[PDB]
Amino acid sequence: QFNPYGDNGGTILGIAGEDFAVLAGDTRNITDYSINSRYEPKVFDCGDNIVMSANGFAADGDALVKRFKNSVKWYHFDHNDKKLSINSAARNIQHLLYSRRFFPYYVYNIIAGLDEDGKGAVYSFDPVGSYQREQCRAGGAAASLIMPFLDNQVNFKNQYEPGTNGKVKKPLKYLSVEEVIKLVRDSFTSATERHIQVGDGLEILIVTKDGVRKEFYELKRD
Amino acid sequence: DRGVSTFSPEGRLFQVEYSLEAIKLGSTAIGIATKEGVVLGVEKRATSPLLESDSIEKIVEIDRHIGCAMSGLTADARSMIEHARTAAVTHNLYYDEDINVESLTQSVCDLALRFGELMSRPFGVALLIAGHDADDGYQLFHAEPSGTFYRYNAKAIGSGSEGAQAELLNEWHSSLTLKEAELLVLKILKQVMEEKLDENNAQLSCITKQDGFKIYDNEKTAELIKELKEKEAAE
Amino acid sequence: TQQPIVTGTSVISMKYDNGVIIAADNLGSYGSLLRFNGVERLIPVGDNTVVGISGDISDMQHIERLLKDLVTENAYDNPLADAEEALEPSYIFEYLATVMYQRRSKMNPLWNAIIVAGVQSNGDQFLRYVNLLGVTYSSPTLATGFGAHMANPLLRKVVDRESDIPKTTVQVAEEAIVNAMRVLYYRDARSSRNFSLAIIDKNTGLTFKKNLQVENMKWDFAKDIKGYGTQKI
Amino acid sequence: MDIILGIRVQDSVILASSKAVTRGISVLKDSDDKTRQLSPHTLMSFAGEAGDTVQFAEYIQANIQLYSIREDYELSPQAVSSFVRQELAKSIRSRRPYQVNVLIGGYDKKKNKPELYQIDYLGTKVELPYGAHGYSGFYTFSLLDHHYRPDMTTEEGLDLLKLCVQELEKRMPMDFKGVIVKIVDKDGIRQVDDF
Amino acid sequence: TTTLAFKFQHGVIAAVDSRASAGSYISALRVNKVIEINPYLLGTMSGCAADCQYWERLLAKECRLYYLRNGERISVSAASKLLSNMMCQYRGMGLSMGSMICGWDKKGPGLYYVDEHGTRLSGNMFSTGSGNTYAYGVLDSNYKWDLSVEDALYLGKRSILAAAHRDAYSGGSVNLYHVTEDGWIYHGNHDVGELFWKVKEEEGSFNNVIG
Amino acid sequence: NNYDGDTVTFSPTGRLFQVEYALEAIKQGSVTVGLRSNTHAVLVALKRNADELSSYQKKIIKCDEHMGLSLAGLAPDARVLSNYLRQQCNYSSLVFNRKLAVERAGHLLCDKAQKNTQSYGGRPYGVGLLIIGYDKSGAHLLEFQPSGNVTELYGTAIGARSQGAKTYLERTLDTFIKIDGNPDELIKAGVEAISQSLRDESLTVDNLSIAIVGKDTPFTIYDGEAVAKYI
Amino acid sequence: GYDRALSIFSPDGHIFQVEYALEAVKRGTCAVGVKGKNCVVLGCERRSTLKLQDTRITPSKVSKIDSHVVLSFSGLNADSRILIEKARVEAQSHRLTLEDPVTVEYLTRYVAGVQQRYTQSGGVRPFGVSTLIAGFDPRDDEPKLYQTEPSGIYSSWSAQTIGRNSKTVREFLEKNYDRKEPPATVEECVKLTVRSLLEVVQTGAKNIEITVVKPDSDIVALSSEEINQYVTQIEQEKQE
Amino acid sequence: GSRRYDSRTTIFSPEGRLYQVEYALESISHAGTAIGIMASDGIVLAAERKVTSTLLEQDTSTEKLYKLNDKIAVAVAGLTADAEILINTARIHAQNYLKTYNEDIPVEILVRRLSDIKQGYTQHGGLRPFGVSFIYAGYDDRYGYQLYTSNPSGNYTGWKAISVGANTSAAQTLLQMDYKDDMKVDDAIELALKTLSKTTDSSALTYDRLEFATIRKGANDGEVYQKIFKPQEIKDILVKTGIT
Ligand SMILES: *[C@@](C)(CO)[C@](*)(O)[C@H](Cc1ccccc1)NC(=O)[C@H](Cc1ccc(OC)cc1)NC(=O)[C@@H](C)NC(=O)C1=CC2=CCC=CC2=C1C
Numbered sequence A: 001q002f003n004p005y006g007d008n009g010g011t012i013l014g015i016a017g018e019d020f021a022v023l024a025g026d027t028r029n030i031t032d033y034s035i036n037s038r039y040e041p042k043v044f045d046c047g048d049n050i051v052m053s054a055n056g057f058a059a060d061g062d063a064l065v066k067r068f069k070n071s072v073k074w075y076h077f078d079h080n081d082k083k084l085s086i087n088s089a090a091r092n093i094q095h096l097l098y099s100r101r102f103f104p105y106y107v108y109n110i111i112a113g114l115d116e117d118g119k120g121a122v123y124s125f126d127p128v129g130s131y132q133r134e135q136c137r138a139g140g141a142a143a144s145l146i147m148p149f150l151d152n153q154v155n156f157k158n159q160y161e162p163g164t165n166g167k168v169k170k171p172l173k174y175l176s177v178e179e180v181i182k183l184v185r186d187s188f189t190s191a192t193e194r195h196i197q198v199g200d201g202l203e204i205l206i207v208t209k210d211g212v213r214k215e216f217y218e219l220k221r222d
Numbered sequence B: 001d002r003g004v005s006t007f008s009p010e011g012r013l014f015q016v017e018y019s020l021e022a023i024k025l026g027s028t029a030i031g032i033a034t035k036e037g038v039v040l041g042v043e044k045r046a047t048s049p050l051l052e053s054d055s056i057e058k059i060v061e062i063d064r065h066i067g068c069a070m071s072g073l074t075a076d077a078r079s080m081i082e083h084a085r086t087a088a089v090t091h092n093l094y095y096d097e098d099i100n101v102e103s104l105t106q107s108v109c110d111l112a113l114r115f116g117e118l119m120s121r122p123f124g125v126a127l128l129i130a131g132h133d134a135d136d137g138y139q140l141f142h143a144e145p146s147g148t149f150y151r152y153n154a155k156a157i158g159s160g161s162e163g164a165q166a167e168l169l170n171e172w173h174s175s176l177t178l179k180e181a182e183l184l185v186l187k188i189l190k191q192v193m194e195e196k197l198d199e200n201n202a203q204l205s206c207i208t209k210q211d212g213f214k215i216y217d218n219e220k221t222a223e224l225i226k227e228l229k230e231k232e233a234a235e
Numbered sequence C: 001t002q003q004p005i006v007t008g009t010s011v012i013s014m015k016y017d018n019g020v021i022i023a024a025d026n027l028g029s030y031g032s033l034l035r036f037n038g039v040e041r042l043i044p045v046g047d048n049t050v051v052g053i054s055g056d057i058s059d060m061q062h063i064e065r066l067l068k069d070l071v072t073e074n075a076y077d078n079p080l081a082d083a084e085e086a087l088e089p090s091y092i093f094e095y096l097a098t099v100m101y102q103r104r105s106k107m108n109p110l111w112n113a114i115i116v117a118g119v120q121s122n123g124d125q126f127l128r129y130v131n132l133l134g135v136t137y138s139s140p141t142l143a144t145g146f147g148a149h150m151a152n153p154l155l156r157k158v159v160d161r162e163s164d165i166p167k168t169t170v171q172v173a174e175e176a177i178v179n180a181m182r183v184l185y186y187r188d189a190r191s192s193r194n195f196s197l198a199i200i201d202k203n204t205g206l207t208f209k210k211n212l213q214v215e216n217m218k219w220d221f222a223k224d225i226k227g228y229g230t231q232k233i
Numbered sequence D: 001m002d003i004i005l006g007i008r009v010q011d012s013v014i015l016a017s018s019k020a021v022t023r024g025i026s027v028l029k030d031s032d033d034k035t036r037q038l039s040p041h042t043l044m045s046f047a048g049e050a051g052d053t054v055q056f057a058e059y060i061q062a063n064i065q066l067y068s069i070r071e072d073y074e075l076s077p078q079a080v081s082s083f084v085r086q087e088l089a090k091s092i093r094s095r096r097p098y099q100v101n102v103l104i105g106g107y108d109k110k111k112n113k114p115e116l117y118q119i120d121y122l123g124t125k126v127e128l129p130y131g132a133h134g135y136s137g138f139y140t141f142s143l144l145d146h147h148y149r150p151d152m153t154t155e156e157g158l159d160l161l162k163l164c165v166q167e168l169e170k171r172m173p174m175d176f177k178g179v180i181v182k183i184v185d186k187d188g189i190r191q192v193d194d195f
Numbered sequence E: 001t002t003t004l005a006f007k008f009q010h011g012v013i014a015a016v017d018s019r020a021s022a023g024s025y026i027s028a029l030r031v032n033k034v035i036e037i038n039p040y041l042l043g044t045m046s047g048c049a050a051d052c053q054y055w056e057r058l059l060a061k062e063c064r065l066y067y068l069r070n071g072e073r074i075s076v077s078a079a080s081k082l083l084s085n086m087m088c089q090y091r092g093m094g095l096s097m098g099s100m101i102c103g104w105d106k107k108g109p110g111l112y113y114v115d116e117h118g119t120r121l122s123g124n125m126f127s128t129g130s131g132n133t134y135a136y137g138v139l140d141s142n143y144k145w146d147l148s149v150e151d152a153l154y155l156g157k158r159s160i161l162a163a164a165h166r167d168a169y170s171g172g173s174v175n176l177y178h179v180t181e182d183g184w185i186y187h188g189n190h191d192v193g194e195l196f197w198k199v200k201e202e203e204g205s206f207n208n209v210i211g
Numbered sequence F: 001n002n003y004d005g006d007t008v009t010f011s012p013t014g015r016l017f018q019v020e021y022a023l024e025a026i027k028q029g030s031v032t033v034g035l036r037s038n039t040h041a042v043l044v045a046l047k048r049n050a051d052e053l054s055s056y057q058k059k060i061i062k063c064d065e066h067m068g069l070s071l072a073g074l075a076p077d078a079r080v081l082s083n084y085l086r087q088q089c090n091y092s093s094l095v096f097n098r099k100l101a102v103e104r105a106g107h108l109l110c111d112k113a114q115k116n117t118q119s120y121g122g123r124p125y126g127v128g129l130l131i132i133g134y135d136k137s138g139a140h141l142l143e144f145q146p147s148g149n150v151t152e153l154y155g156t157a158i159g160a161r162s163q164g165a166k167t168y169l170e171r172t173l174d175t176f177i178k179i180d181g182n183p184d185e186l187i188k189a190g191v192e193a194i195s196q197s198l199r200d201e202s203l204t205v206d207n208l209s210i211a212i213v214g215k216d217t218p219f220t221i222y223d224g225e226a227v228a229k230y231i
Numbered sequence G: 001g002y003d004r005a006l007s008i009f010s011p012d013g014h015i016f017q018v019e020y021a022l023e024a025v026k027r028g029t030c031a032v033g034v035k036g037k038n039c040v041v042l043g044c045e046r047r048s049t050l051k052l053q054d055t056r057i058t059p060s061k062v063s064k065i066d067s068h069v070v071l072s073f074s075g076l077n078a079d080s081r082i083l084i085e086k087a088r089v090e091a092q093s094h095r096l097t098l099e100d101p102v103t104v105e106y107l108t109r110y111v112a113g114v115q116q117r118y119t120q121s122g123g124v125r126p127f128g129v130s131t132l133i134a135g136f137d138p139r140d141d142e143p144k145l146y147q148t149e150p151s152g153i154y155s156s157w158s159a160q161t162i163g164r165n166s167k168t169v170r171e172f173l174e175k176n177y178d179r180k181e182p183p184a185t186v187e188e189c190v191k192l193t194v195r196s197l198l199e200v201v202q203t204g205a206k207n208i209e210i211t212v213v214k215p216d217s218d219i220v221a222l223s224s225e226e227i228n229q230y231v232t233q234i235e236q237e238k239q240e
Numbered sequence H: 001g002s003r004r005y006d007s008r009t010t011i012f013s014p015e016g017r018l019y020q021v022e023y024a025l026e027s028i029s030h031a032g033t034a035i036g037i038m039a040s041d042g043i044v045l046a047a048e049r050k051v052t053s054t055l056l057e058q059d060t061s062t063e064k065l066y067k068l069n070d071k072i073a074v075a076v077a078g079l080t081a082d083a084e085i086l087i088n089t090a091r092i093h094a095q096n097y098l099k100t101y102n103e104d105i106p107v108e109i110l111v112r113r114l115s116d117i118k119q120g121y122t123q124h125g126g127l128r129p130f131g132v133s134f135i136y137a138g139y140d141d142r143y144g145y146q147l148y149t150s151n152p153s154g155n156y157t158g159w160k161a162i163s164v165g166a167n168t169s170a171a172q173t174l175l176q177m178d179y180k181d182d183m184k185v186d187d188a189i190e191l192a193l194k195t196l197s198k199t200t201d202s203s204a205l206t207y208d209r210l211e212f213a214t215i216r217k218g219a220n221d222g223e224v225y226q227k228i229f230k231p232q233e234i235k236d237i238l239v240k241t242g243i244t
């Protein structure tokens, strides 16, 4: 029997700062126990200061991104070159996903950018369209490895202030872009060690009011 | 006979031009755009004193930030309003935001030329679409059955249109207040109307960023009519 | 939904400094039966692209016709059909990729794995893969079926990453491909000795080699092997 | 839903229907009214798959109410029961059938007679002196066979109905949370508020 | 999930948890399971996240169009029915959506339970989700019509807490709402971790648990 | 006369009057000018207002990053045809990863307009279009007529009083074609060309509309104070 | 299918087919609607050219759309049946989807929308019918009276008449009906409705039909003798 | 195109009349007269065949009176072919009703259905209307004995006595004169034949130029019987009433 779905592996990670946002993902593409590509870009600049990554089944992910990029194009045509806000993009993507409620896009989607007040924003989706705005999210193969690390190191969960003994929490101080990129690289280095589908390379897209910037880092190729 | 989508030797669609004649027979509707808001006002024109005038609904809400006035075959406007309301709320569903006044107007005007041998004829009604959005601010549009729409600082449609438009030519300036615009609509309506203007045979409305689209009470309009009479008698 | 009947095995390829190489054997298998021995699975499109196909042969012949028709249609009302507005490898690939993904979304796939190899207008090397699921990826080396498991490891020793491409000559790349085809003949039960090889160079153009054979094979050591453990004679 | 009973006495029809509604392992409601008035002298109780029951009943209700307005006339219980049967017989061969069993209790003003019709989801209609759907009949029909007379009063009909519910409450494993009882006679439809 | 909602003298309380799961994995710690359809209408969510969001936001579109056509707010009864009719179109197609439509209209406070089967029930108290049985236990033993706004809010809060504790697929935080004739009022996000220890000390409950 | 009731009827001399009447609508429309060099292509359009309170009707529409047009005649028909181009440009990108050739875009418009001239019930399009673009064979300018006829040109003009601008371009042919790597000078030549079609009125800040596309220049429209530079 | 555009604009901006549909209404028998303080009355003319008629079974001029709303008309009789049927179907459809009976304003808006649709749809002609729609909204004691016409426009009326010689009876109503103090009782409302028809009807025998609609779905049709008593009392006061 | 040849069958005149309906009525006025008379104990249907021939097989012929079901019958005036199209539709509608409700269709409901079909041809479709006028004679347990008429406009009305076809003006005057409410079937039979005998365009009214039928409760106990008269039976009733 024909199985229309597949698993191309990979892992993605989005973190929202005070006035910036990052969307990272490994560059490895796989089927079963083989490597297809050591460098196959997974996170894309979709225009209007928005970045997107659809992780899971690459064919469905490429189709979704291609469709949203198209949605942005037609948003400009129909509404006098108006900028598509990150919240408006999120809602638009919900309807793209639910259009296939009965034959789903087999992908975990994340977008990142800046809200209308200039603050950092990350939006997370499930395969059928449920979404919400988040501060921190890891998606894909090694999502379960990374998310707890982010709960601990980004939102300071289970961390209290010494001397008080559990009475007073660690205060929620914001993170700089330099501090975030460290947590991203350590997240992917750790995931690469313990997950066979993660490796080869890491590509990070950083979003600020100045625009979209890229950073690439090598990972273990085994 | 002849085609419905036929061109005249002058290069105009017969049916579109004939629908414009029907709009000239309609009751007067006026719109004035200012930096404090856009005012919409209409002549109700009851055919008999037994007709309960408050049931005459020639000013209509499309969204919280968009209003609409009509003139001509007003029955034809109902499907256009229904489409406009649907388009406005549907865009809010897809994009989690208010829809631009221009984009709404364009969606309404796309229906216009969907006629042939689709509906059997063009619409016999013109619309004044007034609203506000963050990008272009306070706006007033004139939507015709030709599918064309012009933006206006001030506009009059209906039977007393060319007389009212000439008056709007002189009176409008870029520093008009909302109160000044209200009195100006009432003034020009009173000038072109057959019967004597009062709170029962004429209606006012406005759209502001804060309060959104509001139709004026008969008690509220009555005070603005009394305020008009006194200021005209003042000189 | 179907099942493949008459099939073609591995298609292998790699980039080198001035272009791309692609190769595939000339066999059409019918299950375990080596039924057809004269099947060409590399199909040139113009003088700048070669499409290598594995999987179901009836679906291959269908694709072969789509491409032939694509060239015809591109020439229509196109004075620059043999120049600026000629078909590019990227155009041909994206067309096929669109077709493959549409067919899988109708649950009626073209049971194939395709590699489009070519050289673009600006001299850039093109090498991208697509299959019955509409899955696409690109790499300095690409291979289908058994080639993915046995050929890629050998070809990745020559071009392990992007920076190794300018350092790789056509002689070295062709040698690596030919060695890979020999290894597949040793170890793939649905392969043949006879194969075709195509080189698309940005200077010398398209070279299409037919009726190639796997040679310099090692079998002599077989004489010494006796039994399955304890047998001496 | 679970249990629906019906009995036709001398001058009226009495319908009893359980109050329970269950999703998963939780009883969401214990006061549910599994019935719709089709016309002033015609009542229909129902039981079957979740959702389908109310949708079907309301659809029938709308059609009968439409007939009443059009003709300014109440259809006989027999006519209504035939209409309902045809809809169910039409439904069973559809892509997704409506899984609903009904009892129709009505008073025919022309003949001055009460009438009870039992119709299952296949479109199987039978006129009866007393009826039930599902497993309800397994426990109650022996009592009704014994005690039922056609000349019974409404009060005697209620007493025999109480005995049926008591037997169900004793021998059924499921808790159906009692029943809402309604009486259909010449004066119309009324609910017995204490049962 | 665990959601609950109940009518009382001073309107209707609505309380939900905030957990989301993907097998044994907790996919989200803080999801919003209430939708603000309008200033006087709320909608709880339980089941498939996508289904809950899509259809309840589509309900809001349809409730908004009602206001524009009629110049009047839709009733809770009519709103719940529009939603139940949507469910009947995709009858047997595999949707999973359990919701309570809470609000205040001309008949007073209104509460309707609606599920994917097209079921539509009116009532004074409901609770949906994997942990509804735990919430019902607290509600049934402590509910009155004569509850004060302060005591009512606490009941719904405490009822979710009970479920969050025992039910493995319920927890994270508690979102509270109170619906009045002037509209709904949000009564905050309450972390269960902190709330549990607070309630344990102040109430004396959860004696078995050590802290 | 008797042969102008519909588009499906030839006259005794072999003329299609409904098409000719549609052509008349273009002549009533406001003037617009098109011209190109080897590196860039430029559209210049005189916008028209209803009165002093009204805005100036937009004349130029973007179709893709590398293609767009200016209109003259029935604006709604231009919206339909431009929407069709947007879809065709977009089909070429999504399916073939290929920017649509300007020549092929003209062929598609020709064929779409033609179907309306041979069938009963419908009507010809009542608008003329000037398409500019930059593709793999350089800069291009096309003139579309609703008869179906599409023509590739160095420069042209359509609308009321368009003959004046067309004569100017016919004289300036050798000069403006050589304006390579200089967008501002090519626009100047277009603004000077459209000026030959003006009477009574002159080019003001909210009257003039300009668009340009080129080698390293996406299709962009200039309105308002952005064109004050060229007045 | 037959797609021919029958309703189209003329050079002077008129849709003749819609205007000729109004002429069919002018030919129809007179219908009148008067709303009192706590009721609405619908009066209807019956032309006495047709005797040997069976009044039991002959279609009545006033039709119930729901238990709380009624519809009378003037114009083509066959056309009116189509509007009434559609209206009745929509009334049940509204109860089924929204769980409330239609308001009088909503039902009118629907019927008016149907009439409008037939003025710009291909292959169809307009309804040669104008309607008077009256009733009381659910849980409301304020009377409602609306009018519709072939073009599709509708509006609310304190009192209104349509059909042949409607110009005359409207003239009567305009001077006799006081807005500040409408018919306080049912008697006064019926009396004014009968008086208005007596300006046009001819004989006050079987030519006048009266239907009283009160709040909370209380609708009754008066008999010949009941109406005849009003006719007697009016003329006896007139002899002075 | 095709528009050139369209007659436009469904339009109003400037006076607000439907051209084709009015012209269809003009056609019907030349058709053989049909009369219906309702009595307390039954209904009579009488109709005149148009200029017949001696070689016409009368006993197997049927051009005027048709049976819709056991309780309802119709008299035809106009195009016979058009009438048969409608009759077969009405026969099906009556059976659909019986299958659905398990009760015989009420007379008015059947009449309304046919009249609605006629109405449709005047408002949409661009086709010519049916050039037919019916007299419906029927019985049900709600209203008892009933007479209706429908015409090409799709408008229907109830009657105590009525005529359609030729000379209806003269025929209606004669019926209005001699009809009384307490009348019986045997008297109504006599009135129907006497009216035809005076209004007919023929020289004399004979058995071979007539179709006749009665609907009587004159059936054994509480039930209704339809009697389509045979040629010999029409001859006998003509002698009995004293016309021949
Ligand atoms: C209980 C947690 C039961 O698990 C609730 O019923 C909860 C309701 C709910 C959650 C979020 C939003 C609205 C309502 N249900 C779930 O969390 C639900 C459980 C579930 C799983 C699978 C099925 O179909 C077999 C039905 C029910 N979980 C999900 O739907 C999963 C797929 N959701 C996510 O993974 C997910 C939702 C989401 C929202 C925003 C951002 C990220 C999100 C993710 C990753």
Ligand SMILES: [Mg+2]
Residues within 6 Å of the ligand: A192, A193, A194, A195, A196, A197, A198, A199, A220, A222
């Ligand atoms: Mg690894």
